[PDB]
Amino acid sequence: QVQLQESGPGLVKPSEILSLTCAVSGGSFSSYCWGWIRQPPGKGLEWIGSICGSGGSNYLNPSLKSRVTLSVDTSKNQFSLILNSVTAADTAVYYCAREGITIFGVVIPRVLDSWGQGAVVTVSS
Amino acid sequence: QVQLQESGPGLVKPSEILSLTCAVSGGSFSSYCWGWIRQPPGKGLEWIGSICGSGGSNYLNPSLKSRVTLSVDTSKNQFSLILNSVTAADTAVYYCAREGITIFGVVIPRVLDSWGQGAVVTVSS
Amino acid sequence: QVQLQESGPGLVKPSEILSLTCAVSGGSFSSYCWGWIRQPPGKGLEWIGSICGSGGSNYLNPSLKSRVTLSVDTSKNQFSLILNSVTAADTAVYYCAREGITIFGVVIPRVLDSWGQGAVVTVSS
Amino acid sequence: AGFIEGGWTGMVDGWYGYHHQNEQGSGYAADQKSTQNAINCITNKVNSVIEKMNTQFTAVGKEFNKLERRMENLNKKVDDGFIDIWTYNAELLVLLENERTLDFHDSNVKNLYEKVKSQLKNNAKEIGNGCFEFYHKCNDECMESVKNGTYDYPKYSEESKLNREKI
Amino acid sequence: AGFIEGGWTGMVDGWYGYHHQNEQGSGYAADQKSTQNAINCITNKVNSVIEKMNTQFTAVGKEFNKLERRMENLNKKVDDGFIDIWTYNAELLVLLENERTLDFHDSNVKNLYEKVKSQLKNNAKEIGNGCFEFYHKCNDECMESVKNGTYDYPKYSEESKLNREKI
Amino acid sequence: AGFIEGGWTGMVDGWYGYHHQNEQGSGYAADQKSTQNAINCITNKVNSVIEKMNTQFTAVGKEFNKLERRMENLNKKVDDGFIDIWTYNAELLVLLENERTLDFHDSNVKNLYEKVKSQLKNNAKEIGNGCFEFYHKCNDECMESVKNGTYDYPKYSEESKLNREKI
Amino acid sequence: DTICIGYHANNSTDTVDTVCEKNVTVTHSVNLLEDSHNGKLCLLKGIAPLQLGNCSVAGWILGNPECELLISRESWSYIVE
Amino acid sequence: DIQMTQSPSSLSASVGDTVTITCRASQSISSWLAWYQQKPGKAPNLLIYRASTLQSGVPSRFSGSGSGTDFTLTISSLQSEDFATYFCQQSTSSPFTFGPGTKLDIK
Amino acid sequence: DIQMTQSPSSLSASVGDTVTITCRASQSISSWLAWYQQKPGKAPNLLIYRASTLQSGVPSRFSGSGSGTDFTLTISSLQSEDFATYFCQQSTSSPFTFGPGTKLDIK
Amino acid sequence: DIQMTQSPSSLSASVGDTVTITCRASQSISSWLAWYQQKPGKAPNLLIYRASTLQSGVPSRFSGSGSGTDFTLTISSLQSEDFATYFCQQSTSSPFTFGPGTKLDIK
Amino acid sequence: CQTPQGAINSSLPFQNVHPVTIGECPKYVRSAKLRMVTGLRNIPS
Ligand SMILES: *[C@@H]1O[C@H](CO)[C@@H](O[C@@H]2O[C@H](CO)[C@@H](O)[C@H](O)[C@H]2NC(C)=O)[C@H](O)[C@H]1NC(C)=O
Ligand SMILES: *[C@@H]1O[C@H](CO)[C@@H](O)[C@H](O)[C@H]1NC(C)=O
Ligand SMILES: *[C@@H]1O[C@H](CO)[C@@H](O)[C@H](O)[C@H]1NC(C)=O
Ligand SMILES: *[C@@H]1O[C@H](CO)[C@@H](O)[C@H](O)[C@H]1NC(C)=O
Ligand SMILES: *[C@@H]1O[C@H](CO)[C@@H](O)[C@H](O)[C@H]1NC(C)=O
Ligand SMILES: *[C@@H]1O[C@H](CO)[C@@H](O)[C@H](O)[C@H]1NC(C)=O
Ligand SMILES: *[C@@H]1O[C@H](CO)[C@@H](O)[C@H](O)[C@H]1NC(C)=O
Ligand SMILES: *[C@@H]1O[C@H](CO)[C@@H](O)[C@H](O)[C@H]1NC(C)=O
Numbered sequence A, B, C: 001q002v003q004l005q006e007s008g009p010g011l012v013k014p015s016e017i018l019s020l021t022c023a024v025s026g027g028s029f030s031s032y033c034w035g036w037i038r039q040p041p042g043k044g045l046e047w048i049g050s051i052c053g054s055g056g057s058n059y060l061n062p063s064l065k066s067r068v069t070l071s072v073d074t075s076k077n078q079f080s081l082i083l084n085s086v087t088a089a090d091t092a093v094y095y096c097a098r099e100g101i102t103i104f105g106v107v108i109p110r111v112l113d114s115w116g117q118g119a120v121v122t123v124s125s
Numbered sequence D, E, F: 001a002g003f004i005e006g007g008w009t010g011m012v013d014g015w016y017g018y019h020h021q022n023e024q025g026s027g028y029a030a031d032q033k034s035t036q037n038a039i040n041c042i043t044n045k046v047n048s049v050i051e052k053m054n055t056q057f058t059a060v061g062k063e064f065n066k067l068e069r070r071m072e073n074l075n076k077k078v079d080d081g082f083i084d085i086w087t088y089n090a091e092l093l094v095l096l097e098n099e100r101t102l103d104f105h106d107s108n109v110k111n112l113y114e115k116v117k118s119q120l121k122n123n124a125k126e127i128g129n130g131c132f133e134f135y136h137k138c139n140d141e142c143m144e145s146v147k148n149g150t151y152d153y154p155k156y157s158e159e160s161k162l163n164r165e166k167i
Numbered sequence G: 001d002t003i004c005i006g007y008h009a010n011n012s013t014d015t016v017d018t019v020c021e022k023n024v025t026v027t028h029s030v031n032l033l034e035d036s037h038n039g040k041l042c043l044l045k046g047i048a049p050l051q052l053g054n055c056s057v058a059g060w061i062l063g064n065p066e067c068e069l070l071i072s073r074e075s076w077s078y079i080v081e
Numbered sequence H, I, J: 001d002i003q004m005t006q007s008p009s010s011l012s013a014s015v016g017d018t019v020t021i022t023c024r025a026s027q028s029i030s031s032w033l034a035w036y037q038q039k040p041g042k043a044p045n046l047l048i049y050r051a052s053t054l055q056s057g058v059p060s061r062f063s064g065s066g067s068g069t070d071f072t073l074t075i076s077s078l079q080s081e082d083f084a085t086y087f088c089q090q091s092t093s094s095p096f097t098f099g100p101g102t103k104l105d106i107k
Numbered sequence K: 001c002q003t004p005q006g007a008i009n010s011s012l013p014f015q016n017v018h019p020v021t022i023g024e025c026p027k028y029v030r031s032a033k034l035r036m037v038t039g040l041r042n043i044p045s
Helices: D032-050 D066-119 D141-148 D155-167 E032-052 E066-120 E140-148 E158-164 F033-050 F069-121 F139-150 F152-164 G057-061 G065-072
Strands: A003-007 A018-025 A033-041 A046-052 A058-059 A069-070 A078-083 A091-098 A120-121 B004-005 B018-027 B033-039 B046-051 B069-073 B078-083 B093-098 B119-123 C003-007 C018-025 C032-038 C048-050 C058-060 C068-073 C078-083 C091-097 C119-121 D124-126 D132-134 E124-126 E131-136 F016-021 F026-028 F124-126 F131-134 G001-006 G014-016 G024-026 G030-032 H005-006 H010-013 H019-025 H031-040 H047-049 H062-067 H070-075 H084-092 H103-106 I004-007 I010-013 I019-025 I034-036 I046-049 I064-066 I070-075 I084-092 I103-106 J003-008 J010-012 J019-025 J034-038 J045-048 J062-067 J070-075 J085-089 J104-106 K035-037
Touching: A018 A091, A018 A120, A018 J104, A046 A078, A046 A091, A046 E032, A058 A069, A058 G030, A058 H010, A078 H070, B004 B093, B004 C078, B018 B119, B046 B069, B093 C068, C003 C091, C003 J085, C018 C091, C048 C068, C058 C068, C058 F026, C091 J104, D032 D066, D032 F069, D066 E066, D066 F069, D141 H047, D141 J045, D155 H084, E032 E066, E066 E131, E066 E140, E066 F069, E124 G057, F016 F033, F016 F069, F033 F069, F069 G001, F069 K035, F124 I103, F139 J070, F152 G057, H019 H031, H019 H084, H031 H062, H084 H103, H103 J010, I004 I084, I010 I019, I019 I084, I034 I064, I084 I103, J019 J045, J045 J062
Parallel strands: H010 H103, I010 I103, J010 J104
Antiparallel strands: A003 A018, A018 A078, A033 A046, A033 A091, A046 A058, A069 A078, A091 A120, B004 B018, B018 B078, B033 B046, B033 B093, B069 B078, B093 B119, C003 C018, C018 C078, C032 C048, C032 C091, C048 C058, C068 C078, C091 C119, D124 D132, E124 E131, F016 F026, F016 G001, F124 F131, F131 G001, G014 G024, G030 K035, H005 H019, H019 H070, H031 H047, H031 H084, H062 H070, I004 I019, I019 I070, I034 I046, I034 I084, I064 I070, J003 J019, J019 J070, J034 J045, J034 J085, J062 J070
16 A cells, blocks of 8 residues: 655645655555645546656656756655746645556556545745 | 440541540449440450549550540449541451459459440441 | 588698598588587587588688688589688587477577587697 | 558558559559468368367257256256357457457568568658658659569669669 | 666656656656557557357267267267367467567567657667767757657757767 | 669679779678578577477377267367467468568668668769769779768768769 | 679479469478378387287177187277278 | 637536536537646546547546547436536647636525 | 450360360469350350359359469350350459450250 | 587597587577588588478487577487587578588497 | 377377377378478578
8 A cells, every 4th residue: 555645834835846755654655656746625536747666767758847846855755846836826736646556567657546535735924 | 134225427528526425324334334445347345445433533445545546424324435536447447345243353454245226336448 | 310521631830731620421502501520638529611502601700700711512412611810729520410400490500400420639749 | 652651542452562653653562472372271260160060959948847956957057158258258259359360461562572672672651551652763664563563673773773872 | 877788677657668868857757658559559469369269058978888989979079079179270379479469569569660760760879788978968858749749840959069079 | 783683693692782883993892790690580580480499208199999989079170270370370370471581682682782871961862773973083992981881971072072073 | 892682592393382372382391291101010118919810800809710819908098801 | 829719608408317518619629629627726537538439537428529620428317416617628739729618506 | 454365266076975165265363253145136144253152143054263374164054045246354454355256056 | 690609518428328519609690500410531411400300311319409599419329320529500691601610439 | 109000109199190189299280291481492502
């Protein structure tokens, strides 16, 4: 069983760097990609980016590509997301989760089976 | 089964436009090719050219390619031949005929079944 | 079964043409390659070069490529070795053998079955 | 039109053909060498599956009394196994053959593509859709020779070279 | 590395993928379209072999006494016949399919390689290890356009030509 | 002397080989690696067709009196079914395997041609008959390096360019 | 200087049947059909079979005086008749 | 960017009923979708992958079907735990656009 | 160009007698040939297409055989309505030349 | 190019014993190998070709097997004529070098 | 393998000498010719 835990500041003023850490218990950064999901209140789910293997694969959503940077940090068993120039439109509830469905030896892309509890991040002055 | 009727002047002096038509009843210009076969008296049948599909699909007899011209009109349901620089050697019985034989969904090339009743024209002064 | 007979000079001075002629009885130069094998006194075998067909396919050892030239003539029915700039290390028991073995219509490369009885030659003063 | 984008309804004459585009006329044409070989050949495959099949005078219907039940079960086992092997083998055979037939067709298309490209190595550019725009000017005779396969490179090489220089 | 050299283990996203090297960043990638199409196919192929097998309630073991020796011989012969035909056809079927599936994977790899070469044309030099090296400086947009198939040749033709003149 | 023209008869050393023409010498040669792969492959295929078959001690001939007509009919039916299935399976299998053998051999020829063409992309003029005529003059070590797979472009690039300029 | 690509051919006229073709002449082939027979009855699994000369199974097992000499055999793979 | 449309916006059903929920794709996706249900304030879980297969740990009342542009999910019998919002997702290309969601109410 | 020859030029036979008419082509036309009979003063009609198949609406007394360069058409039972000239045709190349023709007379 | 090694260098055995000789190769030679025995002062003869098959005219007591970098030759009953030296040869590429040789002797 | 007409070798998987076989025998077929190609197309130069 894989359990995802996420820690965050919970408040960040606009145009201030945003750092998020998600640590995994009971699993390793081997043969399983790791993705990031966010949702604003009262809206749908969005996909930010994905880090697979051990930093081997880095895929970012094209729209947010410029401001998003994703580090693997396998040694500490925690994958992190770094955000800059965050505005009031970027308030959401940040989810870290694992892509594990595998058929015929290959993993199914971005179809997430195990999810974290969720961390709330709001942007305000 | 389709009946083919051809109309020709039957007499022509040398060296002008020689035009003959052929009308089709009970059929259309859809997926069935059409051809003209001519037979000089005392000699064999001769293939002068063909028309297929609604339009285009033009390949002619290389010996007589320059002088001949073929065309169709779908509204009048007819197909006609245009011949110029006629000589006494061009005196023949003109047959307008259709090849409808198809195997595996493709028409058999230059193997014709339904023929016209005959159009004979004489070249004299 | 083919019979192989080889004729050699039996004695050779340093640095001149060394030529031996190997004759075969009961066989022809058709669909079978022919090669030369020499062994130094008390050392292992090695392959000098091979001819196949009738002068069509010529294979030489990379170390002895400039030194050995193989010539055939089916009418006299012998194959011969021509060696120039002979040295003291060339003292060997020359064997001529037939590439008689085949699988699925190909002649296996360099797998020999029937050899000659051997012709001794020494390089000395 | 490119073969990747769509098929051609116009070429009723043959499976494979070259659409011809020129100033004096625009239309369609058929490549007969390849099409005739394929049609005669596909016939052999269909004939092989239906001709090899041999049948003999057999009576599969058997009637057994209540005290011959052991024999009856044997007949049910025999004909059930026969029809099951015949179904599985035939269904797999038809499926495998269909995939190969479609592929054989794709291989023929690729072979004709490579043949016309080896005929027209650099006198015309490749748009990638399956058409060759001529740099030089070619009438019906030379383009028919391309269909004939008797097209000659050095005659139109200088015009193609000067058209490269212009562009 | 290269596909003739071996297979990468870093890419887990899909069976086939790209490795882009650039000044701003380098990483692995996957071509989802090709990998996804392949999975549905083999899923059908594996499913077809397993599903087509149909069964009806069947009793195989039959018992006969001494007075029915011919029958027990007949039952043994027919059961041996069914199991022999079943094992032979199946063993050949798995062997032929295994060869096809492995060949289909490589044929796909060869088809993919050419698509990149055609899009790039002469702008790059083929190292021959399965890697294309760009003469012109190419940013992340033109690598992802190579992935997209929307790479435009005349945009970078001048820089590539100047780099050909330098080299 | 090309593969599209026909097949050579002088060489018997391998199924696949090269013919070299030089001032120093002229003769045939054979690709041991390519042929060895193919011979092994064909051997494995034939062995699998014959070996996977395993026969058991069975008795075919049966005797029945006039009273047991149904048993005789059943034995005739099962024997006819077995021989019909075996004939159909064997004939379709051998036809398909012959076509695979010819296709695999043609594919080997095309692979060898594309390999030597990729090695000699522009150093040698391509006749189109299966012959690569070198622009640059080079001795036997050059051609065996082409056989070795270690041919290099920059060593003979300038002489080849000068020979293109001459022609 | 020319490099040529070619394939091996020989004098063999073996004919093979290929789906989509017929009577293809090839350089070598293997025969999976054994239409040849020794023409002599032989031991099966290394056991000499019982020989019945002008005799039946019934005459052999009932002890026909003409069939008496054939009973002395102890083991047999099959029976000829 | 592929377009995801989910219909209806909302629906009310009781215990033991049968409901069919549909997500629609503007671009044709063969047999590759994902269906998640999300409790209010909780993380979404995975129900159906490949639009025809059932995830382990998920009850057998959930069924997925469809091909091409139109796909459906059918509930055999509504249970109290299944009343939460459902989401449809496509997985063929980037950016992987996610569904708008549909809420089910107790009637 | 495909050269066409038919032999014999003229043949006469009685009714009810079998007869084989041979047409021959210099080049290889594979199995694609055709057969036309022509009543005097009337348009010809098709007998056999592909050298081995019978056209619908045509009696079964006509049978065609052969391959390669040589080809034969055989009549099982000759009747009065078969008294006509016969043509042989190549369909693999342009011009698709027809045959010279062979006459048939009461004997 | 493909270096050849043999092990054991020297072995002694009596009549009727079982002896395994393992020639080893630097790089994979697949299944291609030739085994030769050389009487002192006589012509060597072929024993095993392709590492698994017997050449005709050789007694069936000899057996060879193996694949990859390692191969073995197994003799069941070793008579007086089999006491000569043995050789291992590779046949995949030039130069076609031979093994150093393994000598057999009584006790 | 043994048939009333004569003995048949058991190396090859198929035979057509006789339908009635005794012992470990190849499967009987009605095919006149059963050959598999192990080479290429033979064409003269
Ligand atoms: C088994 O039957 C054969 C067939 O009749 C016998 O062969 C004949 O024997 C008689 C008596 O010596 C001869 O006159 C005939 O010429 C034989 N005919 C042939 C075709 O050989 C044979 O002798 C019988 N054997 C025994 C042991 O009864
Ligand atoms: C195919 O269908 C279209 C639309 O009904 C029609 O216009 C066309 O004529 C048809 N073609 C043939 C060959 O039936
Ligand atoms: C077309 O090719 C044939 C090949 O035999 C040749 O004889 C003929 O002259 C060519 N015709 C044209 C149009 O070039
Ligand atoms: C990728 O290709 C598609 C279709 O050709 C196009 O709509 C899209 O804009 C392309 N993406 C980029 C970044 O150019
Ligand atoms: C042939 O190639 C091998 C490996 O690439 C190399 O070691 C060898 O030196 C080459 N031979 C020549 C003559 O270049
Ligand atoms: C093949 O025939 C030619 C005809 O001259 C002959 O020289 C050659 O020896 C023959 N080869 C074989 C293997 O029979
Ligand atoms: C194949 O060749 C053989 C021998 O010449 C012949 O008997 C047989 O009829 C041929 N088969 C066909 C289909 O022509
Ligand atoms: C086949 O069996 C017969 C039995 O007499 C024997 O003579 C022959 O040598 C055998 N052939 C093979 C191929 O083993």
